[PDB]
Enzyme design. Structure first.
Site, PDB file in Angstrom:
ATOM      1  N   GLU A 268       5.291   4.462   8.686  1.00 56.34           N
ATOM      2  CA  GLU A 268       4.690   4.269  10.011  1.00 56.34           C
ATOM      3  C   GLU A 268       5.688   3.967  11.120  1.00 56.34           C
ATOM      4  O   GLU A 268       5.421   3.113  11.977  1.00 56.34           O
ATOM      5  CB  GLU A 268       3.605   3.170   9.925  1.00 56.34           C
ATOM      6  CG  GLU A 268       4.139   1.769   9.621  1.00 56.34           C
ATOM      7  CD  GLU A 268       4.253   1.331   8.175  1.00 56.34           C
ATOM      8  OE1 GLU A 268       4.379   2.193   7.272  1.00 56.34           O
ATOM      9  OE2 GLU A 268       4.239   0.100   7.949  1.00 56.34           O
ATOM     10  N   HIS A 292      -3.756   6.822   7.249  1.00 59.53           N
ATOM     11  CA  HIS A 292      -3.104   5.566   6.876  1.00 59.53           C
ATOM     12  C   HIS A 292      -1.952   5.283   7.838  1.00 59.53           C
ATOM     13  O   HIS A 292      -1.927   4.217   8.442  1.00 59.53           O
ATOM     14  CB  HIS A 292      -2.574   5.644   5.442  1.00 59.53           C
ATOM     15  CG  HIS A 292      -1.978   4.356   4.974  1.00 59.53           C
ATOM     16  ND1 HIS A 292      -2.746   3.410   4.307  1.00 59.53           N
ATOM     17  CD2 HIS A 292      -0.714   3.889   5.098  1.00 59.53           C
ATOM     18  CE1 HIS A 292      -1.927   2.410   4.027  1.00 59.53           C
ATOM     19  NE2 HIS A 292      -0.697   2.646   4.484  1.00 59.53           N
ATOM     20  N   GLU A 293      -1.047   6.264   8.046  1.00 58.55           N
ATOM     21  CA  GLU A 293       0.098   6.059   8.964  1.00 58.55           C
ATOM     22  C   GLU A 293      -0.340   5.790  10.415  1.00 58.55           C
ATOM     23  O   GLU A 293       0.239   4.929  11.104  1.00 58.55           O
ATOM     24  CB  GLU A 293       1.097   7.231   8.883  1.00 58.55           C
ATOM     25  CG  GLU A 293       1.792   7.389   7.532  1.00 58.55           C
ATOM     26  CD  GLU A 293       2.207   6.125   6.795  1.00 58.55           C
ATOM     27  OE1 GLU A 293       2.761   5.201   7.437  1.00 58.55           O
ATOM     28  OE2 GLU A 293       2.013   6.079   5.558  1.00 58.55           O
ATOM     29  N   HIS A 296      -1.541   2.172  10.899  1.00 58.46           N
ATOM     30  CA  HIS A 296      -0.428   1.223  11.018  1.00 58.46           C
ATOM     31  C   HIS A 296       0.000   0.962  12.475  1.00 58.46           C
ATOM     32  O   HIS A 296       0.594  -0.077  12.742  1.00 58.46           O
ATOM     33  CB  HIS A 296       0.782   1.679  10.190  1.00 58.46           C
ATOM     34  CG  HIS A 296       0.795   1.202   8.761  1.00 58.46           C
ATOM     35  ND1 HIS A 296       0.646  -0.139   8.441  1.00 58.46           N
ATOM     36  CD2 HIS A 296       1.070   1.891   7.631  1.00 58.46           C
ATOM     37  CE1 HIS A 296       0.802  -0.215   7.134  1.00 58.46           C
ATOM     38  NE2 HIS A 296       1.085   0.974   6.607  1.00 58.46           N
ATOM     39  N   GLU A 315      -0.825  -3.857   4.655  1.00 58.58           N
ATOM     40  CA  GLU A 315      -1.414  -2.813   3.828  1.00 58.58           C
ATOM     41  C   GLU A 315      -2.914  -2.828   3.629  1.00 58.58           C
ATOM     42  O   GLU A 315      -3.541  -1.760   3.684  1.00 58.58           O
ATOM     43  CB  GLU A 315      -0.654  -2.627   2.517  1.00 58.58           C
ATOM     44  CG  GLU A 315       0.815  -2.288   2.743  1.00 58.58           C
ATOM     45  CD  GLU A 315       1.170  -1.095   3.618  1.00 58.58           C
ATOM     46  OE1 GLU A 315       0.356  -0.150   3.722  1.00 58.58           O
ATOM     47  OE2 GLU A 315       2.287  -1.093   4.179  1.00 58.58           O
ATOM     48  N   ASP A 372      11.795  -4.110  -3.150  1.00 61.60           N
ATOM     49  CA  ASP A 372      11.633  -2.761  -3.721  1.00 61.60           C
ATOM     50  C   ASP A 372      11.156  -2.796  -5.182  1.00 61.60           C
ATOM     51  O   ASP A 372      10.475  -1.876  -5.620  1.00 61.60           O
ATOM     52  CB  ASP A 372      12.933  -1.946  -3.619  1.00 61.60           C
ATOM     53  CG  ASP A 372      13.356  -1.596  -2.197  1.00 61.60           C
ATOM     54  OD1 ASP A 372      12.469  -1.423  -1.332  1.00 61.60           O
ATOM     55  OD2 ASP A 372      14.563  -1.476  -1.959  1.00 61.60           O
ATOM     56  N   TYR A 380      -2.033  -3.008  -1.253  1.00 58.86           N
ATOM     57  CA  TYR A 380      -2.893  -1.966  -0.673  1.00 58.86           C
ATOM     58  C   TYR A 380      -4.325  -2.124  -1.141  1.00 58.86           C
ATOM     59  O   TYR A 380      -5.223  -2.282  -0.317  1.00 58.86           O
ATOM     60  CB  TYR A 380      -2.418  -0.559  -1.106  1.00 58.86           C
ATOM     61  CG  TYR A 380      -1.083  -0.148  -0.535  1.00 58.86           C
ATOM     62  CD1 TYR A 380       0.109  -0.630  -1.078  1.00 58.86           C
ATOM     63  CD2 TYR A 380      -1.003   0.777   0.500  1.00 58.86           C
ATOM     64  CE1 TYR A 380       1.342  -0.225  -0.586  1.00 58.86           C
ATOM     65  CE2 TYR A 380       0.231   1.198   0.998  1.00 58.86           C
ATOM     66  CZ  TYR A 380       1.399   0.683   0.459  1.00 58.86           C
ATOM     67  OH  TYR A 380       2.618   1.021   0.975  1.00 58.86           O
TER      68      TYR A 380
HETATM   69  O1  LIG Z   1       2.694  -8.060  -1.996  1.00 56.94           O
HETATM   70  C1  LIG Z   1       3.621  -7.482  -2.905  1.00 56.94           C
HETATM   71  C2  LIG Z   1       4.781  -6.905  -2.115  1.00 56.94           C
HETATM   72  C3  LIG Z   1       5.297  -5.672  -2.451  1.00 56.94           C
HETATM   73  C4  LIG Z   1       6.322  -5.097  -1.737  1.00 56.94           C
HETATM   74  C5  LIG Z   1       6.893  -5.760  -0.657  1.00 56.94           C
HETATM   75  O2  LIG Z   1       7.927  -5.230   0.078  1.00 56.94           O
HETATM   76  C6  LIG Z   1       8.100  -3.895   0.358  1.00 56.94           C
HETATM   77  C7  LIG Z   1       7.350  -3.304   1.339  1.00 56.94           C
HETATM   78  C8  LIG Z   1       7.486  -1.954   1.644  1.00 56.94           C
HETATM   79  C9  LIG Z   1       8.429  -1.172   1.005  1.00 56.94           C
HETATM   80  C10 LIG Z   1       9.205  -1.774   0.021  1.00 56.94           C
HETATM   81  C11 LIG Z   1       9.049  -3.118  -0.298  1.00 56.94           C
HETATM   82  C12 LIG Z   1       6.361  -6.992  -0.319  1.00 56.94           C
HETATM   83  C13 LIG Z   1       5.301  -7.552  -1.023  1.00 56.94           C
HETATM   84 ZN   LIG Z   2       0.982   1.461   4.645  1.00 56.05          ZN
END
Ligand SMILES: OCc1ccc(Oc2ccccc2)cc1
Ligand SMILES: [Zn+2]
Ligand SMILES: [Yb+3]
Ligand SMILES: [Yb+3]
Length: 607
Positions: A268, A292-293, A296, A315, A372, A380
């Protein structure tokens, strides 16, 4: 407190603006330039500040036209190295200063992917793209790499003249580079304050086509026509989203169709959403990714999560809005079909991590966790499940959409926590607090596993998928003759995907059942990425050797993690393909996206 950032927090100082001047060097695979940060002190007698960096080379730091003392701390794994800057004069509260940092990125920047001409559609020019979410902006430039800080930006990017630069901003012209006639300078302006994870850059042989009043689709020449058609519903989706969330404040809504190694379905980036070319199904069937995008632009880009622990806010609300857009376009039965599909994806994620795993919690604790590694469908789908449950509990979609619009208005241009959201929910629904007190808040927000309550879902469109999946699962050898191409005549592409999703949940099926499925349905001929992915997973888990080259090809010819990660893992779990999966990963590793390369390595236990 943002446990993912090593920079001075928002209570100490706040970046107000970034003025970026850089040059893209394809020969060295480096971005070199100056990041001029306008920093506002939030404290009395401020004499130093800390910024996040990751694998950056710092040449100098200039304040008031003079070079200042700085020091790079020891690297802290995925977080990078802290950069402490000694201010020449002590700052009082609200006083602003400009700090210009001369830097250079590493070719191994976790934020960037450098593609050779062979790795592009055109084969004549190289390509570069960024992906800053969650904490990769520190691998591009020194910054307070936290979504708790919002800033505006201006940028001038020097690139080889035959190439085009685009950013998460409004295009502000192009000129020949006055310092080099072999180069062009592309200018950008982002006047709306954003968290730094929304900073984005692409450089390549890009072409554009107008598809709506405020939308250009951008890609290499070869993909323009297909992209224009695939994303033609964009304007109608923006109009529905504006009706649900309030004014679209970003000016333009452009789309960029990246090369196949793009790790996510969409990103997004404000003014310029990035999308996977795996959406190019030819029938607009994967357009929910655009919805979805688009969503955002309100939930995530205007109202932002204060820390990554509260990512579900971004999300959950976006999926909720995305499902309403698709509901307005296709009907309420379709929104329920998508919602029920999402619950199925949540069951899969909970089962994959385990029901007691901390990554299945809605609010996560990312202390000493690489975001990551924590990334999944949980924020989501569990996020969506909570809002959908609340919608049903509070009086229906019309009532709940009223709260969503008030929530967006309330927190626009701000960074918030789960408690901020919960406080506003109670404030808005003050006349229904008795109903709100029946919600098991501790379980929904802080407990692992499946939510304590499953919402109510219309089954109309799902019934045929379940019925066909159950016929296949309960079928014995002597029932296989009864299946025929006619079983699918009344199934949409979405229903065909759901039929595969339902069957995959019970995988493996007998090898003879899978062979019959190919014989009668010819699933091998389907190019739709979602359907093909599920079908190949079904074949590999059901131990069909013939599917091994098809699964290896899909895992490597594209790099969307949703597909590449499970395909590599399924192939590694099948004895017949184990060695091939490992060797294929080893051969491709050097030319993969750095994040995807890291995660596939961890999944395959290949260091
Ligand atoms: O709530 C679980 C959770 C998962 C991922 C997260 O961070 C990300 C977000 C987007 C892309 C990569 C990592 C933060 C929290
Ligand atoms: Zn998203
Ligand atoms: Yb201008
Ligand atoms: Yb039988």
């Amino acid at each position: 407190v943002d446990t993912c950032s090593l920079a001075s927090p928002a209570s100490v100082c706040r970046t107000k603006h970034l003025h970026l001047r850089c040059s893209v060097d394809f020969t060295r695979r480096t971005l070199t330039g100056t990041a001029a940060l306008t920093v506002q002190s939030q404290e009395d007698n401020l004499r130093s500040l800390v910024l996040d960096t990751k694998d950056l080379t710092i040449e100098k730091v200039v304040i008031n036209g003079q070079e200042v003392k700085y020091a790079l701390g020891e690297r802290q794994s995925y977080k990078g190295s802290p950069m402490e800057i000694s201010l020449p004069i002590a700052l009082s509260k609200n006083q602003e200063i400009v700090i210009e940092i001369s830097f250079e990125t590493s070719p191994k920047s976790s934020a960037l992917q450098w593609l050779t001409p062979e790795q592009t559609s055109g084969k004549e020019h190289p390509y570069l793209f960024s992906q800053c979410q969650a904490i990769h902006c520190r691998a591009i430039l020194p910054c307070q790499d936290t979504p708790s800080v919002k800033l505006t930006y201006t940028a001038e990017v020097s690139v080889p003249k035959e190439l085009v630069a685009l950013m998460s901003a409004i295009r502000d012209g192009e000129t020949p580079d006055p310092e080099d006639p072999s180069r062009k300078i592309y200018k950008f302006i982002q006047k709306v304050p954003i968290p730094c994870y929304l900073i984005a850059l692409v450089v390549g042989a890009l072409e554009s086509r107008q598809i709506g009043p405020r939308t250009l689709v951008w890609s290499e020449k070869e993909q323009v026509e297909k992209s224009a058609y695939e994303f033609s519903e964009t304007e109608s989706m923006l109009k529905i989203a504006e009706d649900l969330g309030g004014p679209y404040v970003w000016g333009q809504y452009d789309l960029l169709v990246l090369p196949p190694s793009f790790p996510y379905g969409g990103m997004e980036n404000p003014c310029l959403t990035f999308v996977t070319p795996t959406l190019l199904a030819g029938d607009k069937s994967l357009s929910n990714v655009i919805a979805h995008e688009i969503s955002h632009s309100w939930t995530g880009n205007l109202v932002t999560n204060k820390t990554w622990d509260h990512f579900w806010l971004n999300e959950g609300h976006t999926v909720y809005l995305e499902r309403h857009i698709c509901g307005r376009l296709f009907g309420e039965k379709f929104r329920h079909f998508n919602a029920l599909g999402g619950w199925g994806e949540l069951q899969n994620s909970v089962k994959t991590f385990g029901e007691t795993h901390p990554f299945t919690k809605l609010v996560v604790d990312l202390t000493d966790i690489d975001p990551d590694v924590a990334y999944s469908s949980v924020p989501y789908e569990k996020g969506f499940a909570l809002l959908f449950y609340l919608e049903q509990l509070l009086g229906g979609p019309e009532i709940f959409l009223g709260f969503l619009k008030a929530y967006v208005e309330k927190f626009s241009y701000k960074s918030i926590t789960t408690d901020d959201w919960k406080d506003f929910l109670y404030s808005y629904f003050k006349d229904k607090v008795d109903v709100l007190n029946q919600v098991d808040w501790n379980a929904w927000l802080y407990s692992p596993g499946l939510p304590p309550i499953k919402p109510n879902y219309d089954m109309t469109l799902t019934n045929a998928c379940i019925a066909l999946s159950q016929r296949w699962i309960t079928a014995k050898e002597d029932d296989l003759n009864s299946f025929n191409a006619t079983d699918l005549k009344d199934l949409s592409s979405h229903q065909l995907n759901e039929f595969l999703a339902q069957t995959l949940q019970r995988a493996p099926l007998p090898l003879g059942h899978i062979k019959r499925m190919q014989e009668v349905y010819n699933f091998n001929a389907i190019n739709n990425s979602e359907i093909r992915f599920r079908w190949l997973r079904l074949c590999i888990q059901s131990k069909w050797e013939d599917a091994i080259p098809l699964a290896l090809k899909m895992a490597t010819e594209q790099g969307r993690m949703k597909f590449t990660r499970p395909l590599f893992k399924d192939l590694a779990a099948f004895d017949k393909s184990h060695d091939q999966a490992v060797r294929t990963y080893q051969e491709h590793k050097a030319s993969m996206h750095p994040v995807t390369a890291m995660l596939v390595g961890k999944d395959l236990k290949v260091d």
